[PDB]
Amino acid sequence: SSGVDLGTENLYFQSMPRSIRFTAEEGDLGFTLRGNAPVQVHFLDPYCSASVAGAREGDYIVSIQLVDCKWLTLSEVMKLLKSFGEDEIEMKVVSLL
Amino acid sequence: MHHHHHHSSGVDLGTENLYFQSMPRSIRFTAEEGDLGFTLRGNAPVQVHFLDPYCSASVAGAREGDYIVSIQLVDCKWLTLSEVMKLLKSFGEDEIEMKVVSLL
């Protein structure tokens, strides 16, 4: 099969926003965040629900439900995620910006 | 509220993963027929973008989004896309060693 077909398909996958539905079980988000606009997932506990849902280190958070996160600071994205408590969180991430 | 979860430390594993993705790693590969098998994007550092999964760079473990930090003992951290391309072109079909990081 064509390496150009597979590789460009891979690129699409890594570049298109994908939906991660997860919980900060017991308040604990299971990852740290880094940078601004967009903010990036840094440390990620492999056992946490965000990881199990396919979040990865280095992913950029582009939205939390229908709230745009592309232009938000680290502090702002943290405050948004904190607001969910233990309820269901949906965010979209991209592995390549 | 809090439950104990019996398994290895997620913090141990996660921080180890971060080290792996953050420390420069050596990729030794060849551009068979001068065909490098990947495109490049951005500046200082330049990033691997498209990557043919059949190419030697891929087989060596390069990935999409990796940042090129060195080519042999030439520092690439501050180089433009054009400069990095000219460096890689210079190898022709000879062995290329570059170091990449997955997280910058």
Q: In whole angstroms, give the CA distance from residue A21 to residue A55.
A: 10
Yes or no, beta carbons of B65 and A8 under 8 Å apart: no
Q: What region does B44 belong to: left with phi over 0, alpha with psi -120 to 50, or beta?
A: left
How deeply is B55 buried, as exposed, middle or buried, from its count of CB atoms within 10 A (0-12, 13-18, 19+)? buried
CB-based contacts of A83, cutoff 8 Å, min separation 6: none
* φ, ψ (nearest 5 deg) of residue B98: -130, 155
Whether A15 and A94 have beta carbons less than 8 Å apart is answered as: yes
Q: In whole angstroms, give the CA distance from residue B40 to residue B54.
A: 17
How deeply is B83 buried, as exposed, middle or buried, from its count of CB atoms within 10 A (0-12, 13-18, 19+)? middle
Q: Which one of B18, B38, B100 would you mutate to disrupt binding with A, by most A Cβ within 10 Å of its Cβ?
A: B18
Query: Resolution, rounded to a tenth of an Å?
Result: 1.8
Side chain identity at B61, as an amino acid letter?
G
Q: What region does A27 belong to: left with phi over 0, alpha with psi -120 to 50, or beta?
A: left
Whether B52 and B36 have beta carbons less than 8 Å apart is answered as: no
Query: Could you give the 3-state DSSP secondary structure of residue A60?
Result: strand
Interface A-B, measured as beta-carbon pairs within 8 A, has a size of 64
Q: Which CATH number fits domain B1-104: 2.30.42.10, 3.40.50.300, 2.130.10.10, 3.20.20.70?
A: 2.30.42.10
CB-based contacts of B82, cutoff 8 Å, min separation 6: none
In this structure, what token pair is assigned to residue B4?
């104990």
Number of continuous H segments (helices) and E segments (strands) in chain A: 3, 6
Query: DSSP state, A54?
Result: T
Looking only at the bridges linking them, the beta strands covering B38-41 and B47-51 are antiparallel
- Residues facing B75 on adjacent strands: B70
Whether A54 and A36 have beta carbons less than 8 Å apart is answered as: no
Yes or no, beta carbons of A47 and B10 under 8 Å apart: yes
Q: Which CATH number fits domain A13-97: 3.30.70.2740, 3.20.20.60, 2.30.42.10, 3.50.50.60?
A: 2.30.42.10
